[PDB]
Amino acid sequence: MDMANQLLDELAHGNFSHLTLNLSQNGREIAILQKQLTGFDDKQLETFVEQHPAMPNDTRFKIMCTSFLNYARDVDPWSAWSSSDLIFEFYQCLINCLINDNAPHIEMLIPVATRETEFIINLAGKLDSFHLQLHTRSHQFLSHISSILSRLFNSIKPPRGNASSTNIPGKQRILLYLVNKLNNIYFRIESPQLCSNIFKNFQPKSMLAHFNEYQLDQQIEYRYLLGRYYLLNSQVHNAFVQFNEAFQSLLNLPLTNQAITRNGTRILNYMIPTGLILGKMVKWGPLRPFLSQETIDNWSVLYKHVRYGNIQGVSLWLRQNERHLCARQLLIVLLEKLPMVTYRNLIKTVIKSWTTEWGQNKLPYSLIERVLQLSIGPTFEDPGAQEITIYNGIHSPKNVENVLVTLINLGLLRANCFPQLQLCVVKKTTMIQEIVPPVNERITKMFPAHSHVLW
Amino acid sequence: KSLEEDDEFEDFPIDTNIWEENWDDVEVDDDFTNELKAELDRYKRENQ
Amino acid sequence: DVRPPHILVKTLDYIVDNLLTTLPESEGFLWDRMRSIRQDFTYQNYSGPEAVDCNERIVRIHLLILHIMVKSNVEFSLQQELEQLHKSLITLSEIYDDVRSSGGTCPNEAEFRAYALLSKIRDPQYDENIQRLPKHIFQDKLVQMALCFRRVISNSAYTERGFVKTENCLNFYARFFQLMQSPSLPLLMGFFLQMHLTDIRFYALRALSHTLNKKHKPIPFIYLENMLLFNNRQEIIEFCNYYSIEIINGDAADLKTLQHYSHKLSETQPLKKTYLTCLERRLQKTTYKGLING
């Protein structure tokens, strides 16, 4: 039996059971098709699609079918590179069949498009790893995929304000799926700022009235990627609400797979430092199934150093953890934003005994300079470390007034400064929270994040 | 190995208070806090 | 009509050897001609070693011009200089990416990754880019220095139309002026950092003013001059006059009278760029050509 004619019947009637680039699912049928299609030139295949009965009178659809016939005819299963032109060509045609909202067999083509999207993403990574041997630039294949998915994303239109049906068109069903796929691509090619447009046009294109109406897994991944983006722009609160809601939503999911536990671990790897910057420390109870004991010990060491005002402790912890923190884009933001919390707790313990217990309303700069001598420890000026480092070049016990001034400007210390008296006056009181308020409330009030529930 | 260590979420077939209320009030004597308190006592004593 | 790479190298050699010391008078000539060299590289789609060398030394010449034009009172506005310097740093970054992708290396890459980190000192994009580079580039003393400057310059109260404030920034002005005096600071890098003296000083005085009570006395000019490393008194007087900080007793600044919350005043032009006496003194102790050749 003519298997090309048969396949063209199936494709002409929206039966895409054999329309796939995955030879692990299509191998035998594609082999038969390859033996039967050998002989025919490109124009003969194009004619096979053009003159086929019941074939939709769509140029892009017929281009897709012809491209799949070229693939099946010329595919070399022994060489992923030699067959890559056919594979990527057919993928681009397939996505082209989705740009028109009223394209033929659009609803049947969408699942095919998602399937082939996962396949072509895997193959695109595989081929990008050999960019030197293939004479291609870095991430060229996957970036091409990102362009295709970007045009598909632009083609998705918002709902009509007075729509006549509640039909969720399949282009809307995969909207968040496409957003997370595209943003993940932008993260893997190491150009995550390209997510910006994708994040800006997501909600305007969505027909769903609430963000919680998408699949909760896609919600979790979206909050994860959005939080990582925010954190890439050093917006710690905006990232924090996204990581937090992501991990809560993950706690609601039934723990079916190990990959869900590892995804929760991926969320925590960012939620713990982001929270710590905002003065929040986790309770390890609900985090036992997602974190090893050694990770908990590490973050607990950092927790002690920040909690009791040990700047040298914090810088030492960042120094020992430098590599993996740089891998997750975490070192710079912690190096910059953990110090003010650590200082806050340092002068918190100082003002506690000095003011609430010993009844001294004044904080001389010499006292805070000795305290900073204990907390900071060595600096670039000091001997034994004659080369400047991010861990010894920033913090110096000489800059008492600067630390106090930043603490007061961040709202972490309610006090007045006297530079010519060289002292810092707090309010005479026994309650320490009146002088040093809760840090998370102050930070979140000064930096109000966007709505944690998107919409 | 790369699927488990990479930051990108893994694919899986689809089918609470976790933060400290306040760590300022729950105070625990720390080693560093002990040396800091001792430094506060020595400074309080040299500056009588 | 266009120079091949080796005569572009010959031409930049001619400039480094003959026309550096004609500055500041030859600033427009040199800027235009260097831009012409880079443009000749783009005409031939050439990112080879000659394009790297030329863009590198041209970046260094831009850095020297930044200090020379400001030490004198010739130009005041360095918009075009900073624009072409930035575009040259972008070219160098792209070429470094292509060379790394091809398995090669560039010996001066770290230096100009640092300069690139100083081109847009408050753009998180360059932190993002610097964190994915190799460890020998990231841990290089020059990149470490530029990173330290980016940390101490960060300010949660930095105000400018289109700039989103970030949390828990340091605003370590004192540490900034400590590092600017370091003899380990490369001179051209210092020249690049002198572009932010006015901003850093403004936000220093703002942040300090928020900590003073209402009836606090004006801050003496001596304290603010040692704290902000002003070259002389006329500079801090012109600084206070620019930002409408009332000068009491002709030697004190009443910081509560500072009503501005942004370094950039809405209607008037920015205060003219300034320099540090230590860096000029260091410049008089070396040669222009020496600095440009590394």
Per residue, the 3-state secondary structure of chain C, as one string, reads CCCCHHHHHHHHHHHHHHCHHHCCCCHHHHHHHHHHHHHHHHHCCCCCHHHHHHHHHHHHHHHHHHHHHHHCCCCCCCHHHHHHHHHHHHHHHHHHHHHHHCCCCCCCHHHHHHHHHHHCCCCHHHHHHHHCCCHHHHCCHHHHHHHHHHHHHCCCCCCCCCCCCCCCCCCCHHHHHHHHCCCCCCHHHHHHHHHHHHHHHHHHHHHHHCCECCCCCCEEHHHHHHHHCCCCHHHHHHHHHHCCCCEECCCEECHHHCCCCCCCCCCCCCCCCCCCHHHHHHHCCCCHHHHHCC
The verdict on A196 touching C (C-beta cutoff 8 Å) is: no
Token code pair at residue A283:
């309770």
The verdict on A402 touching C (C-beta cutoff 8 Å) is: yes
- The residue of B6, B10, B18 whose CB has the most chain A CBs within 10 angstroms, and thus the best one to mutate to test that interface, is B18
Q: Between C27-43 and C49-71, two packed helices, what is the crossing angle to 10 degrees? A: 160
Task: With H, G, I as helix, E, B as strand and everything else as coil, classify residue A398.
Answer: coil
The verdict on C213 touching A (C-beta cutoff 8 Å) is: yes
Task: With H, G, I as helix, E, B as strand and everything else as coil, classify residue A362.
Answer: strand
My answer on whether omega of the bond before C183 falls inside 30° of 0, hence cis, is no
Task: With H, G, I as helix, E, B as strand and everything else as coil, classify residue A363.
Answer: strand
Largest CA distance in chain A: 99
- The residue of C154, C168, C180 whose CB has the most chain A CBs within 10 angstroms, and thus the best one to mutate to test that interface, is C168
- Alpha carbon distance A380, C183 (integer Å): 12
Token code pair at residue A316:
């030492």
Q: Is A433 close to B16, i.e. CB distance below 8 A?
A: no
- Alpha carbon distance A187, A167 (integer Å): 33
- What is the C-alpha R_g of chain A? 30
Q: Is C167 close to A405, i.e. CB distance below 8 A?
A: no
Unique residue bearing structure tokens 């800006």: A200
C64-C66-C72-C74 Cα dihedral, nearest 10 degrees: 120
Q: Is C168 close to A399, i.e. CB distance below 8 A?
A: no
A404-A409-A415-A420 Cα dihedral, nearest 10 degrees: 60
Please count the CA atoms within 13 angstroms of the CA of C276 that sit on its side-chain side.
Answer: 27
Query: Which of A137, A277, A425 lies nearest to residue C168, judging by beta carbons?
Result: A277
Token code pair at residue C150:
């980016």
- Which residue, among C86, C94, C12, has the nearest Cα to C46 in the 3D structure? C94
- Alpha carbon distance C11, C192 (integer Å): 25
Task: With H, G, I as helix, E, B as strand and everything else as coil, classify residue A416.
Answer: strand
Q: Alpha-carbon torsion A22, A23, A28, A32, what sign?
A: positive
Q: Which helix (H) or strand (E) holds A364?
A: strand A362-364
- Alpha carbon distance A75, A32 (integer Å): 12
Token code pair at residue C244:
């409408």
Query: Hey, which residues does A364 pair with through a beta bridge?
Result: A423
Task: Using an 8 Å CB-CB cutoff, list chain C residues near A420.
Answer: 217, 219-220, 223
- Alpha carbon distance A234, A406 (integer Å): 18
Query: Which of B10, B23, B39 lies nearest to residue A259, judging by beta carbons?
Result: B10
- Which residue, among C80, C202, C195, C92, has the nearest Cα to C149 in the 3D structure? C195
- Alpha carbon distance A392, C148 (integer Å): 10
Token code pair at residue A393:
């070049």
- Which residue, among A243, A382, A394, A168, has the nearest Cα to C173 in the 3D structure? A394
Q: Which helix (H) or strand (E) holds A410?
A: none
Token code pair at residue C198:
């006015």
With left for phi above 0 and alpha for psi between -120 and 50, is residue A54 left, alpha or beta? left
- Alpha carbon distance A232, C47 (integer Å): 30
Alpha-carbon separation of residue A190 from A107, A147, A176, B11, C108 (angstroms)? 33, 15, 21, 20, 23
Q: Is A375 close to B36, i.e. CB distance below 8 A?
A: yes
Q: How many degrees, rounded to 5, is the angle at CA A294 between CA A289 and CA A295?
A: 70
Token code pair at residue C62:
């831009």
- Which residue, among C125, C181, C119, C127, has the nearest Cα to C151 in the 3D structure? C127
Token code pair at residue A330:
């975490």
The verdict on B24 touching A (C-beta cutoff 8 Å) is: yes
Q: Which helix (H) or strand (E) holds A384?
A: none
Token code pair at residue A117:
């999207």
Token code pair at residue C107:
């010996």
Question: What's the CATH class of domain C5-292?
Answer: mainly alpha
- Which residue, among C81, C112, C282, has the nearest Cα to C195 in the 3D structure? C81
Distance of CA B42 to the CA centre of its chain: 27
Q: How many helices (H) and strands (E) does chain A have?
A: 23, 3
Contacts of A232 (CB under 8 A, 6+ apart): A192, A193, A329, C124, C128
- Alpha carbon distance A401, A380 (integer Å): 19
Q: How many degrees, rounded to 5, is the angle at CA A371 between CA A335 and CA A375?
A: 30
The verdict on A417 touching C (C-beta cutoff 8 Å) is: yes
Task: Using an 8 Å CB-CB cutoff, list chain A residues near B4.
Answer: 262
- What is the C-alpha R_g of chain B? 24
Contacts of C7 (CB under 8 A, 6+ apart): none
Token code pair at residue A220:
């979790």
Token code pair at residue A182:
């595209």
How are beta strands C219-220 and C252-253 bridged, if at all? antiparallel
Token code pair at residue A327:
């891998």
Q: Is A308 close to B40, i.e. CB distance below 8 A?
A: no
**Can you give the residue ranges of every domain in chain C?**
5-292
- The residue of A119, A129, A307, A431 whose CB has the most chain B CBs within 10 angstroms, and thus the best one to mutate to test that interface, is A307
Query: Which of A259, A282, A308 lies nearest to residue B33, judging by beta carbons?
Result: A308
**Can you give the residue ranges of every domain in chain A?**
1-455
Task: With H, G, I as helix, E, B as strand and everything else as coil, classify residue A417.
Answer: strand
The verdict on B48 touching A (C-beta cutoff 8 Å) is: no
Q: Is B11 close to A259, i.e. CB distance below 8 A?
A: yes
Alpha-carbon separation of residue C213 from A77, A81, A306, A354, C210 (angstroms)? 78, 72, 30, 22, 8
Which chain C residue is nearest to residue A340, measuring alpha carbons?
C168
- Asked if C41 contacts C89 with a C-beta cutoff of 8 angstroms, the reply is no
The verdict on C152 touching A (C-beta cutoff 8 Å) is: yes
SS3 content of chain A, % helix, strand, coil (to 5): 65, 5, 35
Q: Between A140-155 and A175-188, two packed helices, what is the crossing angle to 10 degrees? A: 150
Residue A162's Cβ-count burial label (10 Å; 0-12, 13-18, 19+) is: exposed
- Asked if A439 contacts A344 with a C-beta cutoff of 8 angstroms, the reply is yes
Q: How many degrees, rounded to 5, is the angle at CA A263 between CA A259 and CA A269?
A: 140
Token code pair at residue C10:
């010959």
Token code pair at residue A77:
């299963």
- Which residue, among A125, A116, A141, has the nearest Cα to A19 in the 3D structure? A116
Distance of CA A418 to the CA centre of its chain: 46
At least 3 CB pairs under 8 A between chains C and A: yes
Task: With H, G, I as helix, E, B as strand and everything else as coil, classify residue A418.
Answer: strand
Q: How far is A344 from chain C (nearest CA, A)?
A: 11
Token code pair at residue A292:
């090893």
Q: Is B9 close to A188, i.e. CB distance below 8 A?
A: no
- Alpha carbon distance A296, A303 (integer Å): 10
Q: Is A233 close to C164, i.e. CB distance below 8 A?
A: yes
- Asked if A208 contacts A419 with a C-beta cutoff of 8 angstroms, the reply is no
Q: Is C147 close to A332, i.e. CB distance below 8 A?
A: yes
**Can you give the residue ranges of every domain in chain B?**
1-48
With left for phi above 0 and alpha for psi between -120 and 50, is residue A138 left, alpha or beta? beta
DSSP A257-285: -HHHHHHHHHHHHHHHHHHHHTT--B-SS
Task: With H, G, I as helix, E, B as strand and everything else as coil, classify residue A426.
Answer: strand
Q: How far is A259 from chain C (nearest CA, A)?
A: 26
The verdict on C167 touching A (C-beta cutoff 8 Å) is: yes
What ranges in A174-235 are assigned the alpha helix state H? 175-188, 195-200, 202-205, 216-232
Number of other residues whose CB lies within 10 A of the CB of residue A159: 15
- Alpha carbon distance A341, A128 (integer Å): 43
Q: Which amino acid is at A252?
A: N
Query: Which of B8, B36, B44 lies nearest to residue A188, judging by beta carbons?
Result: B8
φ, ψ of residue A83 to 5 degrees: the values are -90, 0
Query: Which of C128, C168, C175 lies nearest to residue A232, judging by beta carbons?
Result: C128
Token code pair at residue C39:
């443009």
